[PDB]
Amino acid sequence: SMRILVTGGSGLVGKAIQKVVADGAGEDWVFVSSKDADLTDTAQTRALFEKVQPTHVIHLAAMVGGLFRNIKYNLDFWRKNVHMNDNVLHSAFEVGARKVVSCLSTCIFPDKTTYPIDETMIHNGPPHNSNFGYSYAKRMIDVQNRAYFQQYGCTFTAVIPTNVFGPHDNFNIEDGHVLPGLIHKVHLAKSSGSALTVWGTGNPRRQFIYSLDLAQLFIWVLREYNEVEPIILSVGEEDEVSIKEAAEAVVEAMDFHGEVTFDGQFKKTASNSKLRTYLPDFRFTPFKQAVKETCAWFTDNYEQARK
């Protein structure tokens, strides 16, 4: 008998976890996504934890977005995220939560670094200075986790997904998630003429993880896995696709037949061999099928979707 509290249950990763149907199955699952509780307010946050009395917490909530927009607000990404993370982790502690699993991103790793990055390298140099406020707030999560563990022996971890995509993503072209950016562009291009890309070489490579797959692995991390050192959740370091190959998959999936044309990292390779030490028999949804499914979702949910 456990009650799982999911912060940011209404975003890309949260909506994916809300299935779970099929079925998660045991567990009382509580999804929150708010207001309902502004995790930036300590009063509202402790109140939220006092009401529901989580035994387990999956922490997805974060101040994100604008993040890939060129005008930066590094004080805001820093202050807002640090408050939320402290509020959430420490409220969890105070009501006696047994486990908290938070979420970091690969873009917070040292800008320098040799590839592939692994879970031990997160603090080994300063992040890229673009979004340093966001990057250091996320890094501090690992720092909080290790502190809780040192002083009270609590088990609080984090997962490190690569680039997540899927239904309920941010499809707003301006704020720059590249995959859902592509889906939206192709959709605009069909009902007009010519069109593409999201501009650039198309050469840069990313590891993409389908939100539905991430949801599976996240429920496993919650149920099992008790390191405090984070775990990279991602497809193999040889299953990256270039942006060009991502556009080719979207164009294929949406049956777009117009012109493409082109004119960032250029790679952030992450190893998933810790994951492979635990789950060697787990298989990711093929990229092309995952793209095709999130394309179909976009077209059948155009009115409801984020931009």
Pick out the residues of the known binding site for substrate.
185, 199, 206
Asked if 134 is an active-site residue, the reply is yes
User: Taking CB under 8 A as the rule, does residue 47 contact a copy of itself?
Assistant: no
- With respect to ligand NDP, which residue has the nearer C-beta, 61 or 254? 61
User: Taking CB under 8 A as the rule, does residue 73 contact a copy of itself?
Assistant: yes
Could you tell me the sign of the dihedral formed by the alpha carbons of 157, 163, 165, 168, in that order?
positive
Q: Select from 5, 48, 63, 231 the one that contacts ligand NDP (CB under 6 A).
A: 63
Q: Pairing between strand 155-161 and 99-103?
A: parallel
User: Taking CB under 8 A as the rule, does residue 79 contact a copy of itself?
Assistant: yes
Partner touching 86 among ligand NDP, a copy of itself, none, CB below 5 to 8 Å by kind: a copy of itself
CB of 10 to ligand NDP, least distance (A): 4
| Annotated catalytic residue, options 73, 115, 134, 152 | 134
User: Taking CB under 6 A as the rule, does residue 66 contact ligand NDP?
Assistant: no
- Find all residues with CB under 8 Å of 200, minimum gap 6, and list them: 243, 262, 263, 264
The distance of Cα 122 from the centroid of its chain, to the nearest Å, equals 16
User: Taking CB under 8 A as the rule, does residue 111 contact a copy of itself?
Assistant: no
- Find all residues with CB under 8 Å of 300, minimum gap 6, and list them: none
CB of 90 to a copy of itself, least distance (A): 7
- With respect to ligand NDP, which residue has the nearer C-beta, 12 or 122? 12
Report the b/e string of 119-151 with b at 16+ CB within 10 A.
beebeeeebeeebbbbbbbbbbbbebbeebbee
Q: Select from 19, 50, 94, 126 the one that contacts a copy of itself (CB under 8 A).
A: 126
Among the listed residues 233, 100, 219, the one whose alpha carbon sits nearest the alpha carbon of residue 156: 100
**Residues carrying an active site annotation:** 134
For a copy of itself, the binding residues (CB under 8 A) are 72-76, 78-79, 82, 86, 90, 123-126, 132-133, 136, 140, 143-144, 146-148, 150-152
For ligand NDP, the binding residues (CB under 6 A) are 7-14, 33-35, 38-40, 60-65, 84, 103, 105, 161, 163-164
